C-alpha cells in the first residue's frame, strides 16, 4: 500500500512518492525559483516573464 499508486488523489503518486516530492524543494534557489514564481503570479496580467 505504501508503494502502490493511490486512487484517492488526482495525482497517481504513491505515499512514498509523495514524500519524495515533498522532500526535494526549491526554497532557497535563485533564478529557478524566481522563474517559477511568475507561473504562480498569473492573477496579474501583462506578465511577460519569458
Amino acid at each position: 500500500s505504501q508503494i502502490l499508486p493511490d486512487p484517492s488523489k488526482p495525482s497517481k503518486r504513491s505515499f512514498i512518492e509523495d514524500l519524495l516530492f515533498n522532500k526535494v524543494t526549491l526554497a532557497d534557489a535563485g533564478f529557478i525559483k524566481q522563474y517559477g514564481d511568475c507561473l504562480g503570479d498569473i492573477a496579474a496580467r501583462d506578465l511577460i516573464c519569458a
Binding site: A44, R45, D46, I48
Partner: protein
C-alpha cells in the same frame, strides 16, 4: 585665458539640473520606451506595493 570647468555626477536621484525636453503623460500597462531623467529603456510600466 578665462577657463571654466564643469563637473557633475551621473545616475543619481535629485535631478534638479536637467535639459529642456518636454515631458509626456503616463499610459500604464503598455510596452513603451520610457525615459526617466536620462535613464531610458523599453518595457511595461505597472503599479507596485
Amino acid at each position: 585665458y578665462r577657463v571654466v570647468v564643469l563637473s557633475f555626477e551621473l545616475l543619481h536621484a535629485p535631478a534638479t539640473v536637467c535639459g529642456p525636453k518636454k515631458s509626456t503623460n503616463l499610459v500604464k500597462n503598455k510596452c513603451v520606451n520610457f525615459n526617466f531623467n536620462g535613464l531610458t529603456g523599453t518595457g511595461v510600466l505597472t503599479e507596485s506595493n
